């Protein structure tokens, strides 16, 4: 399918950036997670980044660590996540869905089989957080064989060779890392570095989404102004879940408010 | 692109977030340069000799082999400054950190011996040291916490996961992914992403080089086997490396069997896990059916790790080295035996290697065999743990 | 009648109950014989090298002398098996015990390093070991109690008197006076009745012999001074002996000043006591006006002793060696400084010697001086004590 | 004076051995100690061995260690002991009085001065427990200069050279050690070794008193039968003091009973 390509063309026509929330699948339980995701979409999410709970998430700070732990406490498994993804796609035929994976979950019972399952449930992209381009060959091959976009990372410390590889190997979107470190809303990244955005464009890379430390509408606007195609926010969203565990109604209301405000900021 | 091979057969690699690849490439280049720099080699040799106390003794056991055809030597890394082999490669990595213009050190520690080594090297060489240690290990290896703090290191307890070595490793790597501009990650075992398995081996290989020279001097021939405990794999690869091309010499690595392999409470992934990707490497690991990383278990904090260094996985795969396991109770018996019959208090990690050598002797007492055990550390850190167990046991 | 001179000037002798004189004469004869026996010397050398880890390093301090004209080396007896210099002479005395057909060992211990040494040597050489230790020292040097017990030694707390080293010495001697037929008294310092001050010096003198060779190798000349803490006097006489005839080399012994000489709570009889007869010798001791032996005090159990070996009293009297004191607080500062600036955790005993060297440097920072401190032991035994103090201090 | 010589001649004529109790001066206090000593004499003690409290009594087991400690708790000093000795001699002009000393108390403010003080108060002998014959020269010289008998020890492990020296250097009595070890009633020594008794007699040594572990009348009889001139008992006496601290009357009664029984056994 061409879900990211279609989205970016539509946003381009509307002179809008994408706003893309991240949540952990099954946090704080399967049923509440599905409701959270529906709320995110209804509130204006242009795409989704969805985490499969993993025991040792080494690119994640405490907020998303704790999201993984909540999902595990609810007994969430990768198999249950794939059931959820199928249900989400059934409801929402065009929204791009990207997974945030750790390598072992992809490698576990065969890389090819993993990407085949992604295709079956209608996932559009997979970002394997601990597989750099240097190690990516079997992952990107399996991805492309199964009509999945493999997502690669452009860090602030990117050199020309990396820029060219990311442009060549990646599909769907390019991840433009705000900063070094791990996920977290307290650690605010820099403005998208224009040098990287304009090099990615030169090399015909997939459109750039800025991620890490994006927690405010101001930052989404700033990403758009800097030439990024959109922005991802995870920890900021997850904090609203964490804060409202005993108040599922308030949780959804506050998620709606936040997502709507972040989306509003993407409009130029 | 790398200067050296990141793989040992199928095992190894550089499975880190993209952010960290420049740091790993920089470290590899610095290592390659240093290895052919006579000034670096002289500085490292000087520290090993005059600060750490190399070469370490090779001690012939006088009592524990009585009435058998086993001759058993112990390579005395317990006599190295700091109390364990960990000191060797820390001195080399600290010099690399300075070669690279880094002012801070991050380290993980389980037994606290790598932590003590990182702290002492940082104190000597003028680096600011922070150490991650699982909260369970802070308790069961408490003497080393005291030592690290007295030497001015920051010790950060890790309560996540199993609150043991893998959790300390996780936090160290998370930290480094944000702090690499100013901090060197002084990884303490022969595992993790390239180039660490290579660097750690090369900075530990004097163990086996000295052993070879000493055993030749004393026996006029090579050992029938060299035996070493295996957590991440540093002391064992350090003992093994110089013998790899001596095909007659057995290389035996001893993983922790914990409460018994059948209980699932062990740290023996090389032989009882399956290949996965975690902590920057493709290596055997203890994992669930779904590919979640399992928590390990050992009485010994230094061996309480659910993976193993990629070079060991490779040496096993080709049949050059053999890997076995030893349970908590077997290790405890070896600890007691060495204390009471040789007057050496070994680390509980090292006690696993000794326990296997004792089994090799006891099972076949008329087999002529010349064995070396790598006595990777002293057991001062363990004496309170072992006391509490032998007491609750009614001894 | 004796084969060797029991006196050093006015100091020394054999002031024991008549019952014990045959045992002392037997020991002297065995020592004299052993000293000229190539087989004994070879056995002793082999144990020192291959079991204990001699020679020990001589480490140049890289940081603590910055901005001064002092060059400071540390003789690393902290790296000897067991963690202190005490191991050297225990191996020699244990061999003597076997030369003499004795099956049991009695030892006293304060810091527990001599106790650990006696236990480890007994385990190695097949002797049954009992150790007297003051009850106060059982608490403040607890890691060594655990070590002694794990190695199969019997540790007997002494509650009499000050419950410290002198009280352990008393009980050991009382025991020996009944058990000498089968037990060797392995006295752990250069004090007590002849021939112990002589034997202990001769079995510790490799410290200074190695130091001389090492400093010549590294500096091309002898030290301006060698500096050692002084309890009973073994580590200091071991460092001093080979330099006695090198008249240019200062010999500086450091007694514990405790809370301050003026408080009377110290262990500095050489300089602040007067001659008396106790523990089998005529020597300076801390005593009341009426001639009762006073209780000593030091933060360090190994220096908490109200007398001193007779050879030190003699070397002082003729002006060959100079003796000074260092307070608890001065020793604590030296401990912290070495931990944080050289990455070495010293025994609190050894910290007294280092503190004096630091004063020699700090008081006269433009004085050119080449100094060696005997770093008599490691501080693992002390880490809990030092922690508790620095905590109560608000650090 | 010739108090020991006179006593032994008298005992010889009566075909009796000597019974000689030991106590610590000032245990459990000065006044009670003086009463104890009077009781010992009234009950038949032929001579006294009296300890001056010392901080570190290395030839003594726990019983006499504790006697020293009691005296110190009562503030007893060597000066007070000498006052006591003067009072004892004033009451009892002929009984031989021997002191049990440790070297430091003799050496403390001059060996000569110590023996001069002994003479002034009318002490007859001094046994310095931690000075062997090999180290004895200044002690025995000062003793003889001040008309004090220096007492030397014949251990069971005595060789011929020691026997000859002890016979030559000693006066008053020769101490015949029952056994190795330290003082104590629980540790029973052997019968006086006849070889040593008969060698001492051959070398014209002062008459032998057997000491260490003598706690029963049977042992006193056995010492006499073996050719010793008498027997010393310390710990057995001191135990009666220890047992009866709260009952000073019973203490004296039990001391009298015990001493009388021990003395009765000395009669042949
Ligand atoms: O808003 P924040 O700071 O929580 O960031 C949320 C990011 N969530 S995500 O799935 O895009 C994401 C993307 C990349 C990650 O690691 C990698 F860069 F190494 F690949 C981890 C998470
Ligand atoms: O009855 P016991 O067992 O208490 O023995 C009492 C002995 N009291 S004493 O003063 O004769 C006495 C005699 C000699 C002593 O030591 C020495 F032999 F080394 F000199 C100690 C005490
Ligand atoms: C986990 C630690 N040490 C492990 C260790 C080990 C196991 O680690 P290697 O497999 O890397 O040698 C062996 N022996 C000793 C004395 C050890 O301290 C640590 O000190 O951090
Ligand atoms: C009292 C003891 N040790 C004393 C000691 C001393 C003081 O004892 P000498 O004066 O005999 O060296 C010095 N250094 C160390 C490390 C010591 O352990 C003992 O271990 O029994
Ligand atoms: Na392992
Ligand atoms: Na002293």
Per DSSP, C17 falls in state -
H or E segment at C14? strand C11-15
For ligand 3, whether the C-beta of B114 sits within 6 Å is: yes
How far apart (Å, rounded) are the C-alpha atoms in residues A249 and A239? 15
Closest of B125, B119, B121, B107 to residue B196, by C-alpha? B107
How far apart (Å, rounded) are the C-alpha atoms in residues C222 and C244? 12
Dihedral of the alpha carbons of D136, D141, D142, D146, in degrees to the nearest 10: 130
State the Rg of chain C over Cα. 19
| A23: helix, strand or coil | strand
Interface test with A, best of B277, B285, B286, B310 (most A CBs within 10 A): B277
Q: Compute the Cα dihedral for D107, D112, D115, D117 and give only its sign.
A: negative
Taken in order of first residue, the domains within chain B and their CATH numbers are 8-52+86-204 (3.40.50.1100), 53-85+205-390 (3.40.50.1100)
Contacts of D214 (CB under 8 A, 6+ apart): D178, D189, D220, D223, D231, D232, D233, D236
How far apart (Å, rounded) are the C-alpha atoms in residues A142 and D142? 107
- Token pair belonging to A266: 């993407």
How far apart (Å, rounded) are the C-alpha atoms in residues C24 and C53? 30
How far apart (Å, rounded) are the C-alpha atoms in residues C188 and C172? 11
* Touching subunits for chain A (3+ Cβ pairs under 8 A): B
Q: How is the beta sheet containing D125-128 ordered, strand by strand?
A: D149-150, D125-128, D97-101, D48-51, D18-24, D230-233, D208-211, D174-177, D153-154
How far apart (Å, rounded) are the C-alpha atoms in residues D237 and D241? 7
How far apart (Å, rounded) are the C-alpha atoms in residues D238 and B1? 90
| A241: helix, strand or coil | helix
- Token pair belonging to C9: 């000037």
User: Distance, in angstroms, between D95 CA and closest chain C CA?
Assistant: 27
User: Distance, in angstroms, between A104 CA and closest chain B CA?
Assistant: 5
Do residues A76 and A30 make contact, with C-beta atoms less than 8 angstroms apart?
yes
Residue nearest to atom 16 of ligand 3 (CA): B377
Give residues after which chain C gaps, C-N over 2.5 angstroms: none
Do residues C50 and B60 make contact, with C-beta atoms less than 8 angstroms apart?
yes
Bridge partners of B140?
Answer: none
How far apart (Å, rounded) are the C-alpha atoms in residues B19 and A130? 10
| Residue C160: alpha-carbon gap to chain centroid | 23
Count Cβ neighbours within 10 Å for each residue of B320-357 and write b for 16 or more, e otherwise: ebebbbbbbebbbbbbbbbbbbbbbbbbbbbbbbbbbb
Contacts of D179 (CB under 8 A, 6+ apart): C178, D156, D187, D188, D189, D190, D212, D213
C1 interfacial to chain D (CB closer than 8 Å): yes
How far apart (Å, rounded) are the C-alpha atoms in residues D238 and D253? 14
Is B292–A162 a contact, with Cβ atoms under 8 angstroms apart? no
Number of other residues whose CB lies within 10 A of the CB of residue C188: 32
DSSP per-residue string spanning C178-196: HHTTTEEE---SS-SSTTH
Bridge partners of D210?
Answer: D176, D231
With left for phi above 0 and alpha for psi between -120 and 50, is residue C387 left, alpha or beta?
alpha
Name the residue of D59, D131, D211, D213 to mutate for ligand 2: max ligand atoms within 8 A of Cβ.
Answer: D211
Do residues A180 and B21 make contact, with C-beta atoms less than 8 angstroms apart?
no
With left for phi above 0 and alpha for psi between -120 and 50, is residue D222 left, alpha or beta?
alpha
Do residues C261 and C223 make contact, with C-beta atoms less than 8 angstroms apart?
no
B367 interfacial to chain A (CB closer than 8 Å): no
- Token pair belonging to B365: 């007492």
Closest of D189, D254, D199 to residue D222, by C-alpha? D189
Residue nearest to atom 12 of ligand 2 (CA): D100
Tell me the catalytic residues of B: 61, 85
How far apart (Å, rounded) are the C-alpha atoms in residues A125 and A106? 13
Closest of B102, A26, C117 to residue B118, by C-alpha? B102
Strands D125-128 and D149-150: parallel
C7 interfacial to chain D (CB closer than 8 Å): no
Chains A, B: CB contacts under 8 A, how many?
95
- Token pair belonging to B260: 């018994």
Is D130–C17 a contact, with Cβ atoms under 8 angstroms apart? yes
- Token pair belonging to A228: 């990024």
With left for phi above 0 and alpha for psi between -120 and 50, is residue A198 left, alpha or beta?
alpha
Q: What is the largest CA-CA distance in chain C?
A: 59
- Closest residue of A to B288, CA-based? A108
Main-chain dihedrals φ then ψ at residue C76, nearest 5 degrees: -90, 65
Place of tokens 């250097």: D169
Which residue out of A46, A60, A124, A254 is catalytically annotated?
Answer: A60
Do residues A198 and A227 make contact, with C-beta atoms less than 8 angstroms apart?
yes
Distance C113 CA to ligand 4 centre (A): 7
Residue nearest to atom 6 of ligand 3 (CA): B302
Distance C308 CA to ligand 6 centre (A): 4
Per DSSP, B349 falls in state H
DSSP per-residue string spanning chain D: --HHHHHHHHHHHTTB-EEEEEEETTSS-HHHHHHHHHHHHHTT-SSEEEEPP-S--TTB-HHHHHHHHHHHHTT--HHHHHHHHHHHHHH-SSS-EEEEE-HHHHHTT-HHHHHHHHHHHT--EEEETT--GGG-HHHHHHHHHTT-EEP-EE-TT--HHHHHHHHHH--S-EEEESSSS-B-SSS--PPPPHHHHHHHHHTTPPPEEEESS--SHHHHHHHHHHT-SEEEE-HHHHHHHHHTTT-HHHHHHHHHHHHHHHHHHHB-
| A83: helix, strand or coil | helix
Closest of B143, B156, B187 to residue B377, by C-alpha? B143
**Ligand 2 atom closest to residue C18's alpha carbon, by position in its atom list:** 19
Alpha helices in chain B (DSSP H): 21-35, 38-46, 86-99, 113-125, 135-140, 142-150, 165-179, 196-202, 206-219, 234-240, 269-272, 310-317, 328-342, 348-363, 383-392
Is B51–C58 a contact, with Cβ atoms under 8 angstroms apart? no
Count Cβ neighbours within 10 Å for each residue of A127-158 and write b for 16 or more, e otherwise: bbbbbbbbbbeebbebbeebebbbbbbbbbbb
- Token pair belonging to C322: 């100079």
Main-chain dihedrals φ then ψ at residue C225, nearest 5 degrees: -160, 150
Is D135–C15 a contact, with Cβ atoms under 8 angstroms apart? yes
For ligand 1, whether the C-beta of B17 sits within 6 Å is: yes
State the Rg of chain A over Cα. 17
List CB contacts (< 8 A) between C21 and chain D.
132, 134, 162
Listed by start position, the domains of chain D span 1-268
How far apart (Å, rounded) are the C-alpha atoms in residues C352 and C346? 10
User: Distance, in angstroms, between B79 CA and closest chain C CA?
Assistant: 6
Helix then strand then coil, % of chain B, to nearest 5? 45, 20, 30
Resolution in A: 1.2
- Token pair belonging to C134: 């003051």
Is C380–B147 a contact, with Cβ atoms under 8 angstroms apart? yes
H or E segment at B60? strand B58-60
Cα atoms in the Cβ-side hemisphere of radius 13 Å centred on B340: 10
State the Rg of chain D over Cα. 17
DSSP per-residue string spanning A46-66: SSEEEEPP-S--TTB-HHHHH
Distance B352 CA to ligand 4 centre (A): 33
Q: How is the beta sheet containing A97-101 ordered, strand by strand?
A: A149-150, A125-128, A97-101, A48-51, A18-24, A230-233, A208-211, A174-177, A153-154
Strands B183-185 and B225-229: unpaired
Alpha helices in chain C (DSSP H): 21-35, 38-46, 86-99, 113-125, 135-140, 142-150, 165-179, 196-202, 206-219, 234-240, 269-272, 310-317, 328-342, 348-363, 383-392
Closest of B253, B251, B250 to residue B233, by C-alpha? B253
**Ligand 1 atom closest to residue B18's alpha carbon, by position in its atom list:** 19
Number of other residues whose CB lies within 10 A of the CB of residue B156: 15
Place of tokens 């009463």: D35
Closest of A169, A75, A71, A81 to residue A118, by C-alpha? A81
Dihedral of the alpha carbons of A256, A260, A263, A268, in degrees to the nearest 10: 180
Do residues C287 and C15 make contact, with C-beta atoms less than 8 angstroms apart?
no
**Any catalytic annotation for residue C169?**
no
- Closest residue of B to A166, CA-based? B18
Distance A144 CA to ligand 1 centre (A): 22
User: Distance, in angstroms, between C172 CA and closest chain D CA?
Assistant: 10
Dihedral of the alpha carbons of D256, D262, D264, D268, in degrees to the nearest 10: -160
Helix C86-99 vs helix C38-46: angle between axes, to the nearest 10 degrees?
140
Residues with CB under 6 A from ligand 2: C 17; D 22, 49, 59, 64, 100, 127, 129, 153, 175, 177, 183-185, 211-214, 232-236
Name the residue of C56, C113, C309 to mutate for ligand 4: max ligand atoms within 8 A of Cβ.
Answer: C113
Starting from the CA of residue A181, give the closest ligand. 1
**Ligand 4 atom closest to residue C234's alpha carbon, by position in its atom list:** 11
Is C18–D56 a contact, with Cβ atoms under 8 angstroms apart? no
- Token pair belonging to C388: 């508790």
Is B19–A180 a contact, with Cβ atoms under 8 angstroms apart? yes
Do residues B97 and B184 make contact, with C-beta atoms less than 8 angstroms apart?
yes
Dihedral of the alpha carbons of B340, B342, B346, B349, in degrees to the nearest 10: -90
Q: Judged by CB atoms within 8 Å, which residues 163-182 of B form the interface with A?
A: 166, 170, 173-174, 177-181
Do residues A79 and A28 make contact, with C-beta atoms less than 8 angstroms apart?
no
Strands B58-60 and B70-76: antiparallel
How far apart (Å, rounded) are the C-alpha atoms in residues B314 and B7? 9
Contacts of C263 (CB under 8 A, 6+ apart): none
Do residues D48 and D40 make contact, with C-beta atoms less than 8 angstroms apart?
yes
Q: How is the beta sheet containing C280-285 ordered, strand by strand?
A: C7-8, C11-15, C280-285, C274-278
**Any catalytic annotation for residue A31?**
no
Do residues A214 and A175 make contact, with C-beta atoms less than 8 angstroms apart?
no
Strands C183-185 and C104-109: parallel
């Amino acid at each position: 399918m061409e879900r990211y390509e279609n989205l970016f063309a539509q946003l381009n026509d509307r002179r809008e950036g994408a706003f893309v929330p991240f949540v952990t699948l099954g946090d704080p339980g399967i049923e509440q997670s599905l409701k959270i995701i529906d709320t995110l979409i209804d509130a204006g999410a242009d795409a989704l980044e969805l985490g499969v709970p993993f025991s040792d998430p080494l690119a994640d700070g405490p907020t998303i660590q704790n999201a993984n732990l909540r999902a595990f406490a609810a007994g969430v498994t990768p198999a249950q996540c794939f059931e959820m993804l199928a249900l989400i796609r059934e409801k929402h035929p065009t929204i791009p869905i990207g997974l945030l994976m750790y390598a072992n979950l992809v490698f576990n019972n065969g890389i090819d089989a993993f990407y085949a399952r992604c295709e079956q449930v209608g996932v559009d992209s997979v970002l394997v957080a601990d597989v750099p381009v240097e190690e990516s060959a079997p992952f990107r091959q399996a991805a492309l064989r199964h009509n999945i976009a493999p997502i690669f990372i452009c860090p602030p410390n990117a050199d020309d060779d990396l820029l060219r590889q990311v442009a060549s190997y990646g599909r769907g979107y390019t991840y433009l890392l705000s900063r070094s470190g791990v996920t977290g809303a307290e650690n605010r990244g820099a403005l998208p570095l224009h040098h990287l955005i304009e090099k990615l464009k030169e090399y015909h890379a997939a459109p750039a989404l800025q991620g890490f430390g994006i927690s405010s509408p101001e930052q989404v606007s700033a990403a758009v102004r800097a030439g990024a195609a959109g922005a991802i926010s995870g920890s900021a969203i997850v904090k609203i879940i964490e804060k409202n565990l005993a108040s599922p109604k308030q949780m959804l209301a506050e998620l709606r408010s936040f997502v709507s405000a972040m989306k509003a900021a993407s409009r130029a | 692109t790398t200067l050296l091979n990141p793989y040992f057969g199928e095992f190894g690699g550089m499975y880190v977030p993209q952010i960290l690849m420049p740091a790993l490439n920089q470290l590899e280049e610095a290592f390659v340069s240093a290895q052919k720099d006579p000034e670096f080699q002289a500085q490292f040799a000087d520290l090993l000799k005059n600060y750490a106390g190399r070469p370490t003794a090779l001690t012939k056991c006088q009592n524990i082999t009585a009435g058998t055809r086993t001759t058993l030597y112990l390579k005395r890394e317990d006599l190295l400054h700091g109390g364990a082999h960990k000191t060797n490669q820390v001195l080399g990595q600290a010099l690399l950190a300075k070669r690279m213009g880094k002012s801070e050190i991050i380290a993980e520690t389980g037994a606290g011996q790598h932590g003590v080594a990182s702290a002492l090297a940082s104190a000597l060489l003028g680096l600011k040291c922070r150490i991650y240690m699982g909260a369970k290990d802070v308790e069961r290896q408490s003497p080393n916490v005291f030592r690290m703090r007295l030497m001015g290191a920051e010790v950060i307890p890790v309560h996540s996961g199993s609150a043991t070595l893998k959790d300390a490793c996780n936090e160290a790597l998370r930290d480094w992914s944000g702090s690499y501009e100013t901090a060197h990650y002084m990884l303490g075992t022969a595992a993790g992403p390239h180039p660490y398995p290579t660097i750690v081996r090369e900075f530990q290989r004097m163990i086996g080089e000295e052993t070879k020279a000493q055993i030749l001097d004393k026996e006029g021939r090579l050992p029938d086997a060299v035996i070493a405990c295996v957590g991440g794999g540093s002391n064992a690869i350090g003992m093994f490396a110089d013998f790899i091309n001596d095909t007659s010499v057995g290389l035996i690595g001893v993983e922790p069997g914990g409460h018994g392999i059948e209980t699932g409470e062990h740290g023996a992934p090389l032989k009882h896990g399956r290949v996965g990707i975690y902590f920057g490497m493709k290596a055997p690991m203890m994992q669930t059916a779904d590919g979640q990383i399992e928590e390990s278990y050992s009485i010994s904090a230094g061996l309480d790790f659910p993976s193993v260094g990629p070079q060991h996985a490779y040496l096993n795969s080709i049949g050059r080295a053999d890997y076995v396991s030893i349970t908590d109770d077997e290790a405890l018996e070896a600890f007691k035996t060495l204390c009471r019959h040789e007057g050496i208090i070994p680390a509980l990690e090292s006690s696993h290697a000794l326990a296997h050598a004792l089994k090799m002797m006891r099972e076949q007492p008329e087999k002529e065999q010349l064995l070396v055990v790598n006595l990777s550390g002293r057991g001062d850190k363990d004496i309170f743990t072992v006391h509490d167990i032998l007491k609750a046991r009614g001894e």
